[PDB]
Structures are given as structure tokens and as C-alpha cells.
Design a binder for this molecule. Structure first.
Ligand SMILES: CCCCN(C)C(=O)c1c(F)cccc1OCC(=O)N[C@H](CO)Cc1ccccc1
Length: 554
């Protein structure tokens, strides 16, 4: 069937859209070539609609059915909890889209009567009505990139009231089931240093390893009604409260498998028969679907000892080599199988025989050395997009931000350390906001974090070596260097000069600021200070990992 059908009504914005990087002193100190940085808008939405709209031809086979039953046998060990309205409300992001029913995310969080009464009514409706399609809004998402232009991504989400009900029925499921089903291959359970450990150990565990990332084109659109019902069949193997079982069955038929699209102006926009980007089960569902399809395709292709690492639609496979011609051919057979499964490639996959050449989760493993000269593996990526976004959020007030999560994810990197930390710490210090908690977007989720806690966070997510790395690899330095010339970012000597200046200010204030000076900026001085383990709340991160978007943790 068609992933989408359209009536001709437009994908509308509900406010003016900015597509150019403003000319502003603070962002200009970071990046000079402002004309290279752009934000997507609803003006490119029709181009995206064309790409995401197509017919899906799915053909399932014995390997798929075998793998599906192996997954269900493991899902069968799961016992899941129904969340109370209060628990689901506290998981609601503060700046989450308001309901069209007279209340907003803050009213939800405060347990206001209007909000709670309405959420309760929505829940009872899920229990009563198993068929009426649930309305969704379609919007063009505003995302920032560097030229060489991407059309806007389209986001699909239901009303606030429904989102809170999804958490009630399925939060515990999305947070515990993927690990029970996929074990070590479930990527979202890992901190960055633990993802590196698994990739390095899996690689080292093969006699002759071969690995590849697999890019599925427009994954959400490739997701069929069958996939979504199969996904539900895995959820139904959990021990569930009667009302959760019903709310899952109703959400699946009324929301998950598809439904009507309304634009911001309230106009009937079209119809969806594929994955909605903005529902609770998107991340877990995509992960389970991508894992099932890949696991079965490996058997079909006869790849050997194929270890998966799956994070939503992001896939990396590491296996035993059968020789070079054999590998090329088996990988083409793997692609042919995924294609029948309705998971066709975007960029053709290629076999790799070096772990550092594989890009997965938009990152690659690289190597540096700690103060004692020992090798430390860590994740990095091309810094273009992170720098373009840091510049945009510097010039444009963003009640939400992406730069802080970037520093946390990429802390051991040369670029996050010399540029990002230096830049944002200089500014927050001048503005007396080092201590101000920020609402940090990490993938689709939300975390409240004070910049002053960065050292403790980094030491846990990456180890104390993140503050001592040096001797980065030539390829990494090469890549960083070329991006700075391309974006007009001042050279590293200038960032060193800035860091020394902010480091001295951080030290002079003492307290938590001085801890930031000592750990975050020790790379910038000779007279290194003693780096000992720093004398919290990492549970919301560690117990379930990243369980999906529109989730808030404090
Ligand atoms: C819990 C969500 C926020 C806490 N962060 C930031 C995490 O990492 C994280 C964590 F600390 C504990 C548990 C799970 C976590 O994350 C899930 C996940 O898939 N993370 C990956 C790394 O494995 C992010 C990443 C991908 C590529 C390159 C660099 C970093």
C-alpha cells in the first residue's frame, strides 16, 4: 500500500519560519560563513512529501518467521507495568506541544484538573473504542544544516492528551522490552564508552571481521501495517494489566498503523499507512523492526556469525569474513533480503575490514591517548552539523538546545573540547548562567541539566580520560581542520587562547565553576592540575537507556 496519500492541502507552519543564520556577534565569533548555515522550513515540504510517498511491496519468508518467534519467546519473559496518570504526567516535557483541548504541557506537569480530567477521558476512550482513527498533526520540522539543500523532515504526532496515555500503557514496555528481546545488540542501553566497548569487543571477537552499516531509505515510510501489527504481537507477549492490553491493541489500530493527517491550519491533509515519527513506540518499534529484518536477512544471505547493533533505524552488522568476493556477494544477498522485507537501501552498503571506517549512529570509532600514552577508543563524527547548530542556537534563543547534548555525547573529541566547551562556557560565564539548568534535547528526549555538572556527567559517560586525551589520529585532525576552513571557524590556536581565558575566570570563581576550569580545560595549559575522580541522577539514563522521544527526565 501507499505510505501516504495527500488531498492537496498544504503542510503549513503555525508561525513565521527563519531559514537563514542571523548575523550576530556571538555566533560570528564561532562561525564566520553565515550564508552556509540554513534551517529547513515548510517551504521545502512538498519535495519531502514526494520522497516519502511510495508503494511498499513486502514479502515475508521462513527466516523472518523463525526470527520473529525467537524474539517473542524472549518478550514472553517480560512483565510490564501500567503507569498512573501522575507518573505519565511527570514524564511529560515542559515545552511539549500544548493540547488542542485547553491545556499545555505545564498544566500536565502541574497535575491541573483540566489536564488530568481530559487525559483520563482520553484513556477511557482508548479502552472503549478500538477503531476510530486518532487525529494527528503533520508539520515540517525545523532543522539546521550546512550547505553541500536538504528538504524539511515531516513530523507526525497526536494530541498531548493521547501522548500522556501512550506513556501510561507503554512507557514500561518501551523501556524494558527491547533489552529483553535483543540483549547486547540493543544499542540504546549503552552510554558512549559502553557502545565503544561493545563495538571494539565484538570486532575483536571475530577471527577475521567484516562489518557494514546499513542505511534504509526513509525508514519510517518503509514500515508497513504488517510490521506494526507484528511489533504489537511482541508487546502482547508481556504480562500486562487488562487495561494496558486494551490500550495497546486500540493504539495500534487507531494510531500506530496509520491514520489521518491534519495541517496546523486544521485542514485535512492526507492519510498515513506507515510509521508516525512522533509516537511513543517509534524508537522501540523501529529498533525491533530493524533488528528482526536484519537478523532474518543475515540467515538468508548466509553471512556468518553476524552480530547486530541496532538503534532505531540505525544498523551496523559485524560478522565473520568468508573471503572478499564471498563477502561482497553475501552482502548483496543481505540487501536483496532486506529489500523484500520492505527495508531497501539508501546508500548501497559496502563491506569494511577496519572498524574505524564504519559510520554508525552518525559516528565512527577513533583513537587517541591518555596522559600516560595508552590507547583510548572513543566516538566522533564530522563536526559540521554540530558546529552549524551551535552557531544557530547561539544567535537564536532556543528554550530547548542541542549543543549541550552534543558536548555530552562527544566530550572526548578534539572539536567538542576546544571549540564547543570554550565557546559556550565563555558566553555562559559572561552572562552569569553557568548554573542555570538547560532543557537539553538528546535525540527526541528531554533532560534538564546545569552546565556546571558537565564534569561529573562526562566522567561517568566516558571516563576520566576524556579530560586528558591528546595525540588524536591524523584522519581525525584532518577532518576537523577542513571543516573549520569550510565554515569560517577561527583556527584552533584562537580556541586555545579563548579557553585559557575562560579557564582563568572559571578558576577565580571557585566552587563548581573551578571544577569546570580544572577538568574541562586542562588540555589548554602546561602546568596541569591534578586530575582525580570527582567526589548522581544517572538512573533516568542508565536503567532503561533511551527509550524514545517526548520523554522528560530530571
Ligand atoms: C539516556 C540518553 C542520554 C544519555 N546519553 C547521552 C547516553 O549516551 C546514554 C547513557 F548515558 C546511558 C544509557 C544510554 C544512553 O544513550 C543511548 C544511546 O544510544 N547513546 C549513544 C551512545 O551509546 C549516543 C551517541 C551516539 C553516537 C556517538 C556518540 C554518542
Amino acid at each position: 500500500s501507499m505510505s501516504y496519500t495527500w488531498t492537496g492541502a498544504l503542510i503549513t507552519p503555525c508561525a513565521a519560519e527563519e531559514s537563514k543564520l542571523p548575523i550576530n556577534p556571538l555566533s560570528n565569533s564561532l562561525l564566520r560563513h553565515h550564508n552556509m548555515v540554513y534551517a529547513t522550513t515548510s517551504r521545502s515540504a512538498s519535495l519531502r512529501q514526494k520522497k516519502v510517498t511510495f508503494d511498499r511491496l513486502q514479502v515475508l519468508d521462513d527466516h523472518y518467521r523463525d526470527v520473529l518467534k525467537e524474539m517473542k519467546a524472549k518478550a514472553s519473559t517480560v512483565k510490564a507495568k501500567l503507569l498512573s496518570i501522575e507518573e505519565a504526567c511527570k514524564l511529560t516535557p515542559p515545552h511539549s506541544a500544548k493540547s488542542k483541548f485547553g491545556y499545555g504541557a505545564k498544566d500536565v506537569r502541574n497535575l491541573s484538573s483540566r489536564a488530568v480530567n481530559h487525559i483520563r477521558s482520553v484513556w477511557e476512550d482508548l479502552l472503549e473504542d478500538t477503531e476510530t482513527p486518532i487525529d494527528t498533526t503533520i508539520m515540517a520540522k525545523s532543522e539546521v544544516f550546512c550547505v553541500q539543500r536538504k528538504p524539511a523532515r515531516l513530523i507526525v504526532f497526536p494530541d498531548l492528551g493521547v501522548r500522556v496515555c501512550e506513556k501510561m500503557a507503554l512507557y514500561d514496555v518501551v523501556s524494558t522490552l527491547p533489552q529483553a528481546v535483543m540483549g547486547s545488540s540493543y544499542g540504546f542501553q549503552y552510554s558512549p564508552k559502553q557502545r565503544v566497548e561493545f563495538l571494539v569487543n565484538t570486532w575483536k571477537s571475530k577471527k577475521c571481521p567484516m562489518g557494514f552499516s546499513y542505511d534504509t531509505r526513509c525508514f519510517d515510510s518503509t514500515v508497513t501495517e504488517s510490521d506494526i501489527r507484528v511489533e504489537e504481537s511482541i508487546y502482547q507477549c508481556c504480562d500486562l494489566a487488562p487495561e494496558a492490553r486494551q490500550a495497546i491493541r486500540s493504539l495500534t489500530e487507531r494510531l500506530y498503523i496509520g491514520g489521518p493527517l491534519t495541517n496546523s491550519k486544521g485542514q485535512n491533509c492526507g492519510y498515513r499507512r506507515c510509521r508516525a515519527s512522533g509516537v511513543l513506540t517509534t524508537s522501540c518499534g523501529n529498533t525491533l523492526t530493524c533488528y528482526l529484518k536484519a537478523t532474518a536477512a543475515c540467515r538468508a544471505a548466509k553471512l556468518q556469525d553476524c552480530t547486530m547493533l541496532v538503534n532505531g533505524d540505525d544498523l551496523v552488522v559485524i560478522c565473520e569474513s568468508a573471503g572478499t568476493q564471498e563477502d561482497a556477494a553475501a552482502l548483496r544477498a543481505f540487501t536483496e533480503a532486506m529489500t523484500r522485507y520492505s527495508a531497501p537501501p539508501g546508500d548501497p552498503p559496502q563491506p569494511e575490514y577496519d572498524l574505524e571506517l564504519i559510520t554508525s549512529c552518525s559516528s565512527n570509532v577513533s583513537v587517541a591517548h591518555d596522559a600516560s600514552g595508552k590507547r583510548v577508543y572513543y566516538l566522533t563524527r564530522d563536526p559540521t552539523t554540530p558546529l552549524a547548530r551551535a552557531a544557530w542556537e547561539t544567535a537564536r534563543h532556543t528554550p530547548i538546545n542541542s549543543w549541550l547534548g552534543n558536548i555530552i555525547m562527544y566530550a572526548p573529541t578534539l572539536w567538542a573540547r576546544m571549540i564547543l566547551m570554550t565557546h559556550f562556557f565563555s558566553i555562559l560565564l559572561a552572562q552569569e548562567q553557568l548554573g542555570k539548568a538547560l532543557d537539553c534535547q538528546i535525540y527526541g528526549a528531554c533532560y534538564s541539566i546545569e552546565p556546571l555538572d558537565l564534569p561529573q556527567i562526562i566522567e561517568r559517560l566516558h571516563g576520566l580520560s576524556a579530560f586528558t586525551l591528546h595525540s588524536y589520529s591524523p584522519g581525525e585532525i584532518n577532518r576537523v581542520a577542513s571543516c573549520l576552513r569550510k565554515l569560517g571557524v577561527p583556527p584552533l590556536r584562537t580556541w586555545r587562547h579563548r579557553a585559557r581565558s575562560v579557564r582563568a575566570k572559571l578558576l577565580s570563581q571557585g566552587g563548581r565553576a573551578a571544577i569546570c576550569g580544572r577538568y574541562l580545560f586542562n588540555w589548554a595549559v602546561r602546568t596541569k592540575l591534578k586530575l582525580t575522580p570527582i567526589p548522581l541522577d544517572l538512573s533516568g539514563w542508565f536503567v532503561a537507556g533511551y527509550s524514545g522521544g517526548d520523554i522528560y527526565h530530571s
